[PDB]
Design a binder for this molecule. Structure first.
Ligand code: W8N
Length: 130
């Protein structure tokens, strides 16, 4: 839709602070911090697939909107995820150990903008079409 495509990371703000708030250790933060992943979003019927690809780590999720699923995150958290579409924004929540984090993906001009919140920290990552 507005989201379908192959996207390349072009900027990132506050990602180290976001990872630190999630409890990610130094070695993993170091690897994640200067990663420049591609994000590949596709849809077939009810099922949306988001692939995130980078030199040292790939992940993939597939989901139906509104249906909770189990996810292993790139930093190895075992979480329960739910993704919904609200005002054209894809809103993902991950829940684990009584904590949560939200990841909002939105389309703005030429940008896929991804806002990640954990407690007081807000990270913004911008992707452009590859
Ligand atoms: C392999 C890999 C998997 C996920 C991420 C993210 O950064 C995910 C979040 C936090 C959701 C942010 C985003 O999608 O840009 C990075 C890499 Br490298």
């Amino acid at each position: 839709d507005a989201f379908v495509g192959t996207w390349k990371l072009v900027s990132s703000e506050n990602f180290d602070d976001y990872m630190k708030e999630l409890g990610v250790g130094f070695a993993t933060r170091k690897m994640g911090g200067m990663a420049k992943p591609n994000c590949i979003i596709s849809v077939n019927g009810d099922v949306i697939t988001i692939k995130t690809e980078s030199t040292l780590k790939n992940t993939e999720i597939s989901f139906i909107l509104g249906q909770e699923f189990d996810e292993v995150t790139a930093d190895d958290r075992k979480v329960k995820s739910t993704i919904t579409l609200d005002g054209g924004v894809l809103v993902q929540v991950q829940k684990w150990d009584g904590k949560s984090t939200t990841i909002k993906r939105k389309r703005e001009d030429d940008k896929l903008v991804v806002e990640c919140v954990m407690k007081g920290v807000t990270c913004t990552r911008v992707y452009e079409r590859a």
